[PDB]
């Protein structure tokens with residue numbers, strides 16, 4: 001099989017903005033999540049060709065990864081923090097549904113999700 005095209009990171013039809021909340025999320029990604037011990041499976045779109053994962057894109061129809069999220073944040077793709085939070089939720093859920101409960105990679109995703117949720121709790125005023 002082949003890889004699908006990656007998710008879009010810009011779109012001329014979608015309103016764009018830079019906000020304090022979105023800049024906070026970008027900081028969290030660059031300073032903490034990207035550099036995390038468990039970031040490695042989540043930094044780029046899953047390369048099903050390189051990893052020879054024939055089932056991945058049969059199962060995952062809404063792929064999402066931190067490389068895409070980071071690029072969206074850098075490109076002001078989002079209108080609000082909730083849109084970005086939704087992409088993280090998609091990323092974590094994808095891991096949970098492709099893999100099996102208790103798998104090492106699932107425990108990694110759970111740890112990163114826990115940390116992300118702590119960071120969301122500290123999302124600034126505006």
Ligand SMILES: CC(=O)N1CCc2c(c(Nc3ccc(-c4cnn(C)c4)cc3F)nn2[C@H]2CCOC2)C1
Pocket residue numbers: 040041042043046051094095098099105
């Ligand atoms: C997020 C998710 O659910 N995935 C589905 C399962 C999966 C994923 C990766 N990812 C991955 C693997 C290796 C490397 C790597 C090794 N060396 N270098 C330079 C890079 C990078 C990766 F991102 N492995 N696996 C499986 C394959 C065997 O056991 C885990 C993604």
